[PDB]
Amino acid sequence: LFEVAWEVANKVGGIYTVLQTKAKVTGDEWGDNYFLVGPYTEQGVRTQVELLEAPTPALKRTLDSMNSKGCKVYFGRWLIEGGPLVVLLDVGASAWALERWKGELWDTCNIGVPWYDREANDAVLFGFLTTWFLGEFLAQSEEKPHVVAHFHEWLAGVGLCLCRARRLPVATIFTTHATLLGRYLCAGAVDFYNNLENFNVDKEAGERQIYHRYCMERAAAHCAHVFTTVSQITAIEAQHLLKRKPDIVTPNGLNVKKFSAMHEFQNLHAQSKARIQEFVRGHFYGHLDFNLDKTLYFFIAGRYEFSNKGADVFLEALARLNYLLRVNGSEQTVVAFFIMPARTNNFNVETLKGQAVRKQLWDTANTVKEKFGRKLYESLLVGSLPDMNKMLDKEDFTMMKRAIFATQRQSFPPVCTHNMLDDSSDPILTTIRRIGLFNSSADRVKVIFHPEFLSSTSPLLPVDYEEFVRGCHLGVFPSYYEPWGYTPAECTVMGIPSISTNLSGFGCFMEEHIADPSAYGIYILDRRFRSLDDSCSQLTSFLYSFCQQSRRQRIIQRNRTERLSDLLDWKYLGRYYMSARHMALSKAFP
């Protein structure tokens, strides 16, 4: 098996997660005949990969057959023990002969990549290197086994045509997880779901680009022995646009972390929410005028797509929910996070300063705490109950007064934790300042935009993504166009209720698998049969309905949402890959 892809060592939301979750089961069920191919980027990928430059059995012949011939191929383990013997390929090591590879592409399939975008050039170069490695392996192994080559996305789709030109006896499977042409039309301010058969692919390809990419994608789909897509909705645009109906639907699964107790995810949520509460206390210093027990943490994560990931409708719903909470005289407050990576330069002074003063207050309270504890210990040793007024003197009251005065703040807490280099052109900040949300005292919702992926080694918010998601209360992902949707998937795996859409692969998958959804925390939101304003109103209604329920109802809802983890497990969802491999073997050679 060869699961060649571009995201194996570099962290990107797509491809990387599905491969990392699949590797364990796909290796334990099959064995050491599982091989993974990907690129090399000088970004720290070697930190997570245990490279094996020295010769190693289980395809030891290529190391002394081709490595010392002007190429660069490594063998790694990934630090994940699913037996993922990964074949890492360097991109910049072999780039001096791009002209001959372009000529080879011209001879074979009249395709290639223009010099405008280096991403696709690197993808094609990696495809050439992968094809050379696979051919060398077949030559060295005397063609005794019939290996199956599987391809993900267009970043590794040139392998299909390269192998078909050379007629290598392998079973070809191609699985596209996102028709990028659909992605770039859905961002073109044009309706995409009302009609699909009225699109002219060649006319649209090129004004927004995606002409060579579309051509190579369709060539791979046609020439691949087995074609596959993520959701049933994915197959719909695949057969209507690429004119190649997928052989079988292959829903995306996850490696659920089973605990010895059913309620351990609740404890993880409690701890992570405590950490988020510490961050909130840091950010809203001098403005802690709202109860923190009535605070709910909403969030929308993923790549920074405004109209595709559904951030405009979420912000409109947040403004409306703020208006209803203000006019209803409610003590509930909602802190909404926005984890969408936009380029910054560093943090702003306000956020780091807020964390600093929060922990300075923590230190001052600690000091008074040890002094009080020592005096109380003396009193208990003597045998007299404290009268509570003889312990604290004038100096510690003086320093508490000084600390309180130092934390006084007149400006409002910032909406962005980082210092972005383009604030006049950022959609999120623009609409935030348009809808009049500035974390004010009167505001019932507080927006925090964290334009960066979460990491466990960050100066502020020392939580990785999974822990932070476990800490939140509701994940709102009203995405207009996205094939499957991972973020709601692990939200429901970790027990957090989520707001999906009927235009999403996750929402569609959970639509017909459960009778009466939204009773299990899956607030499916209709975006196909409703206008934008109606969808915003429905999102506001869903948010308010989540707000009105008490703590017991929230706990019960989280339990019900967690109970659905078995649907997205790779044990249940891995059978489709096995079926695809069986069809590929039957088509190529029994």
């Binding site: 399939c109 223009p114 010099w115 078909r164 002409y211 051509c215 369709r218 060539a219 020439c223």
Partner: protein, 32 residues
């Protein structure tokens, strides 16, 4: 036809002329 090669190298290809997916469709069947 090096003219087509240079033209597509520039990145601005035609659609109703000699550059279309019809040629790819007609040549892909020879590879399977």
């Amino acid at each position: 036809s090096e003219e087509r090669k240079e033209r597509w190298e520039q990145g601005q290809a035609d659609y109703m002329g000699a550059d279309s997916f019809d040629n790819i469709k007609r040549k892909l069947d020879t590879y399977l």
